[PDB]
Write a protein that binds this DNA or RNA. Structure first.
Ligand SMILES: [Cl-]
Ligand SMILES: [Cl-]
Ligand SMILES: [Mg+2]
Ligand SMILES: [Mg+2]
Ligand SMILES: [Mg+2]
Ligand SMILES: [Mg+2]
Ligand SMILES: [Mg+2]
Ligand SMILES: [Mg+2]
Ligand SMILES: [Mg+2]
Ligand SMILES: [Mg+2]
Ligand SMILES: [Mg+2]
Ligand SMILES: [Mg+2]
Ligand SMILES: [Mg+2]
Ligand SMILES: [Mg+2]
Ligand SMILES: [Mg+2]
Ligand SMILES: [Mg+2]
Ligand SMILES: [Mg+2]
Ligand SMILES: [Mg+2]
Ligand SMILES: [Mg+2]
Ligand SMILES: [Mg+2]
Ligand SMILES: [Mg+2]
Ligand SMILES: [Mg+2]
Ligand SMILES: [Mg+2]
Ligand SMILES: [Mg+2]
Lengths: 49, 185, 51
RNA sequence: GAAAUUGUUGAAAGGGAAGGGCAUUUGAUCAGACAGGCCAGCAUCAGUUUUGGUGGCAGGAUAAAUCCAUAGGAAUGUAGCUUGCCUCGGUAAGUAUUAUAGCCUGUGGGAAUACUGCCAGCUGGGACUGAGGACUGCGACGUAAGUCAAGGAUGCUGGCAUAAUGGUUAUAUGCCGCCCGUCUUGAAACACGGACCAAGGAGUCUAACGUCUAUGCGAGUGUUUGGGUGUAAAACCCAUACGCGUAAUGAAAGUGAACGUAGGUUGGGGCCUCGCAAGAGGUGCACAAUCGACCGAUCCUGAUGUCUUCGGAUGGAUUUGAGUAAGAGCAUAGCUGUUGGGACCCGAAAG
RNA sequence: AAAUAUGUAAGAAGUCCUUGUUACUUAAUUGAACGUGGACAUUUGAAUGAAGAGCUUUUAGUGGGCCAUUUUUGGUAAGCAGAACUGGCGAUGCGGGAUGAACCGAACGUAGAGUUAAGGUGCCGGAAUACACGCUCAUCAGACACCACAAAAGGUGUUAG
RNA sequence: GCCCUGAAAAUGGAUGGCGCUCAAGCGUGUUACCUAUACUCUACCGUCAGGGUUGAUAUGAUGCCCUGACGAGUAGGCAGG
RNA sequence: GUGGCCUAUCGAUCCUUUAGUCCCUCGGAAUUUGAGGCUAGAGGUGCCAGAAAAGUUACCACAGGGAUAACUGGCUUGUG
């Protein structure tokens, strides 16, 4: 995630270079940082999909 | 290599500009391009796209159609918006006192609206009065009443009009159209 | 305009993950384990060495 | 006064073709800036990557072993002992389980190391890249001022300023490269056309049409048969007709499109009301599906009245139409497609 | 009586309650069909994905095919003839199989750096005349899929059982 | 198992060639290394898609600018020159 | 119960002819014959989505075809 992590925003591939973009797209699920995204993956949480 | 699930370099398939070279029409497109970008009003986006339509996609709207729409509940004082031509209809004998904005008015249509106490305005005048389409009513004419449509989808048991030049007794009413001559469709 | 990889650019590693400063300060990557002296039962050892 | 083709002169290459592609050497030739142009060296950074040294942790039989303590056992039997030949000590086979060597198995004790994994541990060498061009963002280090490796390279220095770099061209060297066009499942083919060069050489125009698009006017539309007029095949102006459209349906005689806000239901953009928003409600054009109503045809029902055979009111029917249900068309132009014409160009044996 | 293929379903056009219409149906407001009114929101009814979904008009070329793995018919067989599913060639270069339309790898804008695929690393030829345990001596050894062949039957040659 | 007998065709001849015998052969195991128009990162060209920007006083709103993805092709279609 | 227990047992346009409706037309106006229409069948195309059709060329012609036979060559080897 740190090296090759890109997000899908408006059908576009955007690098995850700051926590602001993650919050703006996954904040409604409680994910607001790159570590929150990692936590949701390693522990398969309610919002894994 | 990439396994493509869809066609690459595919155009959207919608017109982004009018095909005509009318200089005055381009000015209206420039006005509503600015409004659609900086108003987030759904009305402005609809009007801008309607300015790109071809002639068959903008059927005429008669004054009788305008009068019928004004008879709707609560629509008596709304401004009728037609992106196209408004024609006259002599089959109706009473007309309201509404305000109509359209690209073009025929001589009969303009006279009938003014005689009833209304006014005919252009689309740029409408933008000044209602920049966000306040209290407007958009009317579109009928597309499937065109003569070309009745020939589309021709085939057995389809009930469509054949493409024929001369119509009469001896023109495509024999075998294939009646049971006494072979079969019926 | 240029993707800078964290874990090789320390400044970018600090912009994300404000806990990296605490992780390095207390040496969480070399944390020792508490010593325990529990031993396996005889049945486990005999089964392991059984033919 | 072009090309095919040829003479002379000059330059270059040539061991069973020649010609070509990528790269550079050599020869020849040539443009650009000298107002910072050409080529380089080092340092500090950013991006990508390659190859070493080194540190701290975790796991397993909490590695297994080694090592240490202890019990038992055996031989490919150590010391000792017996036995027979033996160039006065060397073998040979019996006994003998640690003694003057040792080994194996079980149990107990404490570590190390291997293997695998982790570190938001540290650090050396090499290569490629420098996109962007005022500021804006997110962070770091600091009491603060500020600084910084934080949304893309700067600093210092040297040589040369011209054929030195580079371009062009000929040649050489390394590797690669079969003759194009055509029909074909398949062509370098022992399949066909082509010795060479120049000029010429093949989807055109017309009548009538389909879809789409542009333009004018719009329930209408079309001035150009003709007339008027003229700066005279132009431009300008115009009456009456006619064409198409505005009604359909029957073989025909014929008849001929509102029970209703021009119907109901479902989905609908936009607009309206309220609401911070999300939403809810109202109205809903175009368009899609469906149930009805209306007009013509077909099959039935047959009222008041009568030239007693005419007339066809009213009500129906798993029937039928290229219909109605607040009109959309007419004219001109363009690409594409269709048919008749020599019909993309050249070609029969015949009549 | 399999395996592989194959139909349908997994909700708002849904479920529940009450009662309106009819010339159909029932001994009978009984039922059938379509409705009025009320309640139930998107962990609203499995998973994954979704370069957005739906729809219309018009026209080009084509209508000789062929090959490979698997299934399979005729035939002694065929680089023979004929079918089934899929992938290919035709229409396609590039790395590999010396060479080849179809095999293997991988599909292609112009460049730089790094890493690989299939295949290879004595010399031609870029890369270990590397490491490890065995086997084989041929007076016609052997050497890598498609693939460019070899059998029955034999040997106190040698090796293991 | 390997090797040998069985094993006869016409120009001269082909594990690709040279050559190779504890192999440079056969079976098997472990590492290092070589190189595609494939993969990763960067630049540039074009195409497509989603966006920003009309404010006068300086010229192209078919302008300028931001972001992401993509690029084989006969018969054939369309577009810009 | 809308032919044969089920799975086959069959036929357009033009023309002729029959049945039905006794209805429509013969266009200057009528009556009667005649003819022409409307709805449903029959007469048949078996090359069965349906031209009306005998040979010969060793006197021969043209457009083509290696989409296809009469030699080699290649694959195969039944047969020899
Ligand atoms: Cl060369
Ligand atoms: Cl009639
Ligand atoms: Mg002269
Ligand atoms: Mg000459
Ligand atoms: Mg040079
Ligand atoms: Mg070659
Ligand atoms: Mg052939
Ligand atoms: Mg060829
Ligand atoms: Mg020929
Ligand atoms: Mg010739
Ligand atoms: Mg010429
Ligand atoms: Mg001729
Ligand atoms: Mg004749
Ligand atoms: Mg072909
Ligand atoms: Mg080969
Ligand atoms: Mg080498
Ligand atoms: Mg080997
Ligand atoms: Mg292309
Ligand atoms: Mg019977
Ligand atoms: Mg029966
Ligand atoms: Mg007469
Ligand atoms: Mg037939
Ligand atoms: Mg042939
Ligand atoms: Mg035989």
């Amino acid at each position: 995630v740190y090296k090759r992590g890109f997000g899908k925003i408006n059908k576009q591939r955007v690098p995850l270079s700051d926590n602001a973009i993650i919050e703006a797209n996954l904040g409604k699920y409680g994910i607001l940082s790159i570590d929150d995204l990692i936590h949701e993956i390693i522990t398969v949480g309610p919002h894994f999909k | 290599g990439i396994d493509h699930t869809s066609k690459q370099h595919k155009r959207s398939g919608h017109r982004t500009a009018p095909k005509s070279d009318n200089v005055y029409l381009k000015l209206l497109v420039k006005l509503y391009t600015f409004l659609a970008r900086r108003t987030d009003a759904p009305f402005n986006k609809v009007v801008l796209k309607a300015l790109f339509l071809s002639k068959i996609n903008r059927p005429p709207v008669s004054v009788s159609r305008i009068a019928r729409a004004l008879k709707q509940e609560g629509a008596a004082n709304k401004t009728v918006v037609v992106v196209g031509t408004v024609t006259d209809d002599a089959r109706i004998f009473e007309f309201p006192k509404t305000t109509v904005a359209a690209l073009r008015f025929t001589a009969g249509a303009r006279a009938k609206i003014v005689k009833a106490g209304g006014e005919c305005i252009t689309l740029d005048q409408l933008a000044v009065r209602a920049p966000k389409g306040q209290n407007t009513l958009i009317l579109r004419g009928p597309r499937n009443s065109r003569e070309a449509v009745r020939h589309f989808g021709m085939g057995p048991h389809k009930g469509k009009a054949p493409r024929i030049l001369s119509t009469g007794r001896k023109f495509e009413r024999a075998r294939g159209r009646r049971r006494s001559k072979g079969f019926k469709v | 305009v240029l993707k800078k990889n964290p874990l090789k650019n320390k400044q970018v590693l600090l912009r994300l993950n404000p806990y990296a400063k605490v992780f390095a300060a207390e040496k969480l990557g070399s944390k020792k384990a508490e010593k325990t002296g529990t031993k396996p039962a005889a049945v486990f050892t005999e089964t392991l060495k059984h033919d």
